[PDB]
Amino acid sequence: GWVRPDLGDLSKVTKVKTDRPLPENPYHSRARPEPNPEVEGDLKPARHGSRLFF
Amino acid sequence: KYIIPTIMLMPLTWLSKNNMIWVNSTAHSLLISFTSLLLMNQFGDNSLNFSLLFFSDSLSTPLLILTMWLLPLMLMASQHHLSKENLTRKKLFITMLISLQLFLIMTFTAMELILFYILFEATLVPTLIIITRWGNQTERLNAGLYFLFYTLAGSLPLLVALIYIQNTVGSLNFLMLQYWVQPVHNSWSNVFMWLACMMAFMVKMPLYGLHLWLPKAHVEAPIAGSMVLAAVLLKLGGYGMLRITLILNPMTDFMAYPFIMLSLWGMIMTSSICLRQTDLKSLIAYSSVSHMALVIVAILIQTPWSYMGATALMIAHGLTSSMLFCLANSNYERIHSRTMILARGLQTLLPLMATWWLLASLTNLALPPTINLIGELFVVMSTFSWSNITIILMGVNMVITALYSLYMLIMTQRGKYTYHINNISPSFTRENALMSLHILPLLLLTLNPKIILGPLY
Numbered sequence: 001g002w003v004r005p006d007l008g009d010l011s012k013v014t015k016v017k018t019d020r021p022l023p024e025n026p027y028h029s030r031a032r033p034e035p036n037p038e039v040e041g042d043l044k045p046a047r048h049g050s051r052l053f054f
Numbered sequence: 055k056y057i058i059p060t061i062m063l064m065p066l067t068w069l070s071k072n073n074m075i076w077v078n079s080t081a082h083s084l085l086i087s088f089t090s091l092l093l094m095n096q097f098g099d100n101s102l103n104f105s106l107l108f109f110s111d112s113l114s115t116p117l118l119i120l121t122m123w124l125l126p127l128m129l130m131a132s133q134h135h136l137s138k139e140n141l142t143r144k145k146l147f148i149t150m151l152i153s154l155q156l157f158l159i160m161t162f163t164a165m166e167l168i169l170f171y172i173l174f175e176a177t178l179v180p181t182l183i184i185i186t187r188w189g190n191q192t193e194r195l196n197a198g199l200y201f202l203f204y205t206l207a208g209s210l211p212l213l214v215a216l217i218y219i220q221n222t223v224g225s226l227n228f229l230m231l232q233y234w235v236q237p238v239h240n241s242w243s244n245v246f247m248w249l250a251c252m253m254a255f256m257v258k259m260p261l262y263g264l265h266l267w268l269p270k271a272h273v274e275a276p277i278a279g280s281m282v283l284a285a286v287l288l289k290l291g292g293y294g295m296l297r298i299t300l301i302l303n304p305m306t307d308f309m310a311y312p313f314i315m316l317s318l319w320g321m322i323m324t325s326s327i328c329l330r331q332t333d334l335k336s337l338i339a340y341s342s343v344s345h346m347a348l349v350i351v352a353i354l355i356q357t358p359w360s361y362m363g364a365t366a367l368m369i370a371h372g373l374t375s376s377m378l379f380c381l382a383n384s385n386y387e388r389i390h391s392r393t394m395i396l397a398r399g400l401q402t403l404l405p406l407m408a409t410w411w412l413l414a415s416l417t418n419l420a421l422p423p424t425i426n427l428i429g430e431l432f433v434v435m436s437t438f439s440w441s442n443i444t445i446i447l448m449g450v451n452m453v454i455t456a457l458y459s460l461y462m463l464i465m466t467q468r469g470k471y472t473y474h475i476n477n478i479s480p481s482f483t484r485e486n487a488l489m490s491l492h493i494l495p496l497l498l499l500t501l502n503p504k505i506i507l508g509p510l511y
Binding site for chain 2: 053
């Protein structure tokens with residue numbers, strides 16, 4: 001029974017553990033709607049100012 | 055081709071020496087006026103396009119030529135005046151007249167409603183400075199304040215109107231583009247849309263109501279009787295009425311019906327007051343209300359005949375009323391008070407000027423066809439198709455137009471001038487030149503004014 005550590009624990013890993021799989025959605029219900037699509041391609045001047053003049 | 059010679063007239067006055075000034079400003083503007091008559095007179099089937107919209111084209115604008123014709127004529131009249139003032143202020147002043155003519159070239163050429171409006175209001179600032187400085191009479195500030203009180207309170211409603219139309223239907227910009235025009239369905243929201251577009255040009259085109267803008271600007275004159283020709287250009291500066299009524303609202307003209315009626319008493323009651331008044335300039339100022347009221351009657355009918363008469367009257371009034379102000383200038387430079395009763399007697403001192411008095415006064419009446427008869431007669435013939443009763447109202451005006459001219463003549467034909475020791479010298483060479491350069495273009499337009507009254511003619 002006699003075993004004393006003179007350093008500590010320092011985060012021990014449990015490789016033998018199986019039990020249940022980790023990814024199973026812990027809190028998330030909705031995936032959230034897809035964001036605005038990113039515009040790919042270089043912009044070209046067509047109208048050259050859509051203001052009152054020029 | 056009309057951009058950057060008037061802008062090149064700007065450094066001309068500053069660079070030239072103190073001995074010259076007036077010799078350069080006039081000679082380098084007369085050759086510029088020659089080029090306007092050389093190039094702008096050409097027309098195809100419809101309206102052309104000279105360039106991309108910075109300054110556009112001409113559709114029914116020989117009125118541009120008139121401003122180019124007055125480009126040296128204002129410098130002719132202000133010669134005895136501003137002769138005793140500072141040389142640096144002479145250079146400052148001519149540039150302000152040039153800047154007025156600069157924006158006036160822009161407004162007639164540009165076929166926009168947005169670019170036109172901001173340069174239509176860009177003529178207001180130079181005139182304000184020209185009126186409020188060098189004014190010979192006291193309380194000239196009332197002539198300055200009411201100049202921007204009556205106009206801007208009516209014209210700033212264009213910003214809420216014009217931008218509203220282009221937000222709904224395409225864009226106003228190119229005008230020849232604007233044939234996407236939907237007929238106005240006559241709704242209560244469209245009531246103020248029509249009114250805001252009109253009220254801006256109900257001030258500069260003087261009615262019976264809101265007409266006090268004009269005589270105060272003439273009685274408290276900018277310069278004696280010299281810079282009044284610019285205020286004559288502001289009267290014909292309300293030519294946007296020709297474009298707004300035609301393009302923006304052709305269907306709904308039920309609201310035009312009370313405005314013709316308001317200007318119908320702006321013919322008789324504006325001519326009645328112009329009979330007893332003491333100021334000689336005011337006797338031209340109130341007569342200029344009635345002759346410009348003719349256009350407001352004409353345009354709102356919208357018949358093809360009225361447009362022929364109106365466009366003629368815009369050019370007719372621009373050379374006849376301005377000529378009358380030059381006669382008022384010649385009397386004021388000698389007596390130094392514009393009282394009609396005091397300044398009495400021609401031919402005894404002024405023999406040659408008396409014939410020029412006739413060729414300027416009788417043009418208010420319908421003479422052998424100059425441009426005034428051609429202007430008036432088409433409008434009267436247009437009002438009959440509108441309603442038969444109009445000529446009863448219009449006929450009274452024809453009587454008081456004789457009470458304009460002859461009353462100006464008789465009060466100067468009475469040979470006395472007992473109290474007057476001045477007016478010893480008859481006339482200068484430039485003095486009689488003003489009488490010729492105003493009347494001889496009217497005399498040349500007797501022959502063929504085809505290139506004057508031209509909205510598809």
